[PDB]
Each structure stands twice: as structure tokens, then as C-alpha cells.
Design a protein around this ligand. Structure first.
Ligand SMILES: CC(C)c1csc(CNC(=O)c2cc[nH]n2)n1
Ligand SMILES: [Zn+2]
Ligand SMILES: [Zn+2]
Ligand SMILES: [Zn+2]
Length: 419
């Protein structure tokens, strides 16, 4: 993003009466009192969604962030207020991103307030590790990343993007409320910071969707994905054996493969891309014969003859960022904005109970280890390994936020007779 690019300044002219209409980033960064550019492109901002922090200042000044926090600088002086800012950003971001990106609906005070807690300079490395530096300390003249900035007092080489440069009509609230009933406006700065990030997420991940953008590994992404594949195979295989459906309607990703390739059933696929905005309406999508597989295909009310994996947007993890209108932004290799978890979607179904099933040839005691050996008295070591490993994946998947649901007649008692 060129510093000589033009910045629309009408949103600033109430806090800053008389501001030039003709303004570049180079002049604005100078006017703000100051790594080619503090400001970044929409594309760069999308690539670093994990770093977004909504930021609003309202005027003695009230700083509010999309973490829900409101600080008053004068009410306490800036020299302590900037300590809090580094601490809050480091604890929010250290497990999410190598930077911060302040998302703004800029009117003026937020930009003029930056010089009181931001230092910039050449790109630097953490004094105590190899990550890029995000903080500076004036007491030691040293730099640190988000993990090692305890005590540091300045944010260093932050990034930022002004949503009001994207060509909106009207003010923040009226634009946010068009898409979002979850965030109100209590007339506190942090409410504006939250609405600003909500709108930005709506524009970049709900209205728009770029599934080519890859995102770095920051946790159990790979173990979770592998667990999900394992559980899916297990659960669909068992449902076909227990109830012997003649046909399975696999509704969802257009690049899906048979997850139980050796099953005897007629496998029919139906293409439906991950819905980002509102959950699909089962009436438009449509199935009464056999069983329907909705593996991460969020609909408003599943049919009764379904197997269902549905991500729960409320889960607290580093992979799941707060989203728009109650949805959440699940970033695991790719970004998937997900509509809000709604329990009523599952009224025709029941929670799927845990169970491990195997027909593979052959100290654990478990009613849920469905195998020949356990049928005959005592679980062999192999199936005791496989069982304890499957339990681990299952628990990983659940804890990652996924939830499983099945037709009410599903009964693991029916699997014992396949031995
Ligand atoms: C006590 C300090 C000095 C202070 C400054 S502004 C404020 C209240 N904030 C708002 O009215 C507001 C407007 C938009 N979003 N929030 N309190
Ligand atoms: Zn470090
Ligand atoms: Zn919102
Ligand atoms: Zn066995």
C-alpha cells in the first residue's frame, strides 16, 4: 500500500476542522506525528485477520478496543495507559498473530492519539526470541514480541486500516446494524471498536469470501482436521452397519469424497458451499429415503434421517475469532465465517453418543469399545490402543467446537451383531 495513495478525509473533518481534502498517507502519517506504511491494504488486512483489534477513541479521552475494554487517558495519565495497552494486546494476540492491525472508523482522535502509545522504526526482532518485535520498552531500550513484552510500555510498528476508506454511506452504526443485531451501541468507545471490527469482518468474510488465502498454523489445526476425518469415517460407517440405509445423500462441500469408500450404499452427492451469512434453508436445498449427511453443512432445521457435524460458534479457542451477527470466524488453514449456533436446528435429532467401533482383526474396560474381543469378554491390546487414540481425536474435535447429532433411532446396540 503506497504511502502516496490518497486518503479520504471527510470523516476526520469534525475532530480536525479544516483538514485538507487532498491528502496522502505520507502527509497523514506525518500529521499523526511520525515497514513501508503504517496503513495496509484490504488484501493485507484479510491475510492478517487474526491480528485485528477494533480501536475507537471518543472525546480527556476514552480509548475503546474490540476486546471490550475502555481506558480513560487524561482517568489516568498516558504513561500508565500505554502500559495497559501493551499488556492487553500481548495477552490477546500472542497466541494468534505476529502483529496487530488496528481497525478503525476514523474520525480523528484515534489517529492523533497513536503517538502517545506507538513507536515505529525498522523491522526488529524480539530481544528474547526470533519473532518480529511488536513492543518497545523505554526503560531498557529493548524490543519484544507479544510473548515477552511483560513490562514494556510502547506498541511498535503496528498496522492499521480505516474502514471508512472503503466507500460507505452514512455512519458506523447504521452500516453495522444492517447486518448485525448482536452488538448494540451503549455509547462507549469499545462499542464502536466492536462494531467497526464486526463490519470489517462482514465485508471481508461474509459478503466476500477468498478461500485461496492460506493462514499459518498456530495450534492444533492439523490434529483437529485429522480427528474430524477419523470421526466422520467412524460415525458414518457405524450408521450404515446399524441401520443399513440403501442410499446416503451427502450434502455439502462440492469436493467431498466418500468417507466410507467400502460401504455398500448408494452414495449421492449434492454441492453446497460453506454458507457464510445465514444458515441454508432446508426447503431451498431440497431425501426422505436412506440417510442425509450434513458434514459441516449448516442448515436451519435438519431432517430427521440425518447424520450431522455442526460447528458451535460459541467455542472459546485461538482458532475461532468473534464474527458478525452472532457467527464466528473459524480460521484453520482457511477462513470460514460460520453462522451462529442455533440449538433448534437439531430438534428432529439427538446428541450423538461417543462410541468406538471396529471390525478389524484383533487393560481397557469400556462399554463403548465395540469390538469382537470386548464382545467375547476382554479387549485385546490393539483395539485398546485404537480405542484410546480414537477417544483422543474425538475429544480434540469436540473441544475444538464441533458437535455431532444423529437420527433418534441410532443405537450402538445394533453394531454388536455385525460380529
Ligand atoms: C470520561 C471520558 C473523558 C469520556 C470521553 S467520551 C466518553 C463517553 N463515550 C461516548 O459517549 C461514545 C461515543 C461514541 N462511542 N462512545 N467518556
Ligand atoms: Zn519474543
Ligand atoms: Zn456486530
Ligand atoms: Zn480386539
Amino acid at each position: 500500500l503506497s504511502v502516496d495513495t490518497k486518503f479520504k478525509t471527510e470523516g476526520l473533518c469534525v475532530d480536525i476542522p479544516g483538514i485538507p481534502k487532498d491528502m496522502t498517507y505520507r502527509r497523514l502519517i506525518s500529521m499523526m506525528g511520525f515497514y513501508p506504511n503504517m496503513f495496509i491494504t484490504r488484501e493485507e488486512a484479510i491475510r492478517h485477520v487474526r491480528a485485528w483489534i477494533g480501536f475507537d477513541v471518543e472525546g480527556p479521552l476514552q480509548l475503546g478496543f474490540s476486546t471490550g475494554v475502555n481506558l480513560v487517558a487524561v482517568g489516568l495519565p498516558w504513561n500508565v495507559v500505554r502500559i495497559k495497552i501493551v499488556q492487553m494486546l500481548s495477552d490477546t494476540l500472542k497466541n494468534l498473530s505476529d502483529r496487530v492491525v488496528f481497525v478503525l472508523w476514523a474520525h480523528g482522535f484515534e489517529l492523533t492519539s497513536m503517538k502517545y502509545f506507538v513507536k515505529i522504526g525498522p523491522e526488529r526482532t524480539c530481544c528474547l526470541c526470533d519473532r518480529r518485535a511488536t513492543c518497545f520498552s523505554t526503560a531498557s531500550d529493548t524490543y519484544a514480541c507479544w510473548h515477552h513484552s511483560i513490562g514494556f510500555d510502547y506498541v511498535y510498528n503496528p498496522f492499521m486500516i480505516d474502514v471508512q476508506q472503503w466507500g460507505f454511506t452514512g455512519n458506523l452504526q447504521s452500516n453495522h446494524d444492517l447486518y448485525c443485531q448482536v452488538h448494540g451501541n451503549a455509547h462507549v468507545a469499545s462499542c464502536d471498536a466492536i462494531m467497526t471490527r464486526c463490519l470489517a469482518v462482514h465485508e471481508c468474510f461474509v459478503k466476500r469470501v477468498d478461500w485461496t488465502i492460506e493462514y499459518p498454523i498456530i495450534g492444533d489445526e492439523l490434529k483437529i482436521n485429522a480427528a474430524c476425518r477419523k470421526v466422520q469415517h467412524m460415525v458414518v460407517k457405524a450408521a450404515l452397519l446399524a441401520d443399513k440405509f440403501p442410499v446416503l445423500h451427502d450434502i455439502g462441500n462440492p469436493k467431498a469424497i466418500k468417507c466410507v469408500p467400502q460401504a455398500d450404499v448408494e452414495w449421492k452427492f449434492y454441492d453446497a458451499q460453506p454458507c457464510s451469512d445465514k444458515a441454508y434453508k432446508i426447503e431451498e436445498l431440497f431425501f426422505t429415503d436412506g440417510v442425509c449427511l450434513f458434514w459441516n453443512c449448516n442448515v436451519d432445521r435438519y431432517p430427521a434421517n440425518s447424520i450431522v457435524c455442526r460447528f458451535d460458534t460459541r467455542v472459546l479457542s485461538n482458532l475461532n475469532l468473534p464474527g458478525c451477527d452472532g457467527g464466528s470466524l473459524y480460521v484453520n488453514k482457511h477462513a470460514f465465517h460460520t453462522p451462529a449456533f442455533d440449538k433448534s436446528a437439531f430438534v428432529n435429532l439427538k446428541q450423538l453418543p461417543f462410541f468406538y467401533y471396529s471390525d478389524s482383526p484383533c487393560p481397557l474396560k469400556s462399554a463403548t469399545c465395540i469390538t469382537r474381543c470386548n464382545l467375547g469378554g476382554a479387549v485385546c491390546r490393539h483395539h485398546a490402543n485404537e480405542y484410546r487414540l480414537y477417544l483422543d481425536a474425538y475429544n480434540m474435535m469436540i473441544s475444538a467446537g464441533f458437535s455431532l447429532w444423529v437420527y433418534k433411532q441410532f443405537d450402538t446396540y445394533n453394531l454388536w451383531n455385525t460380529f
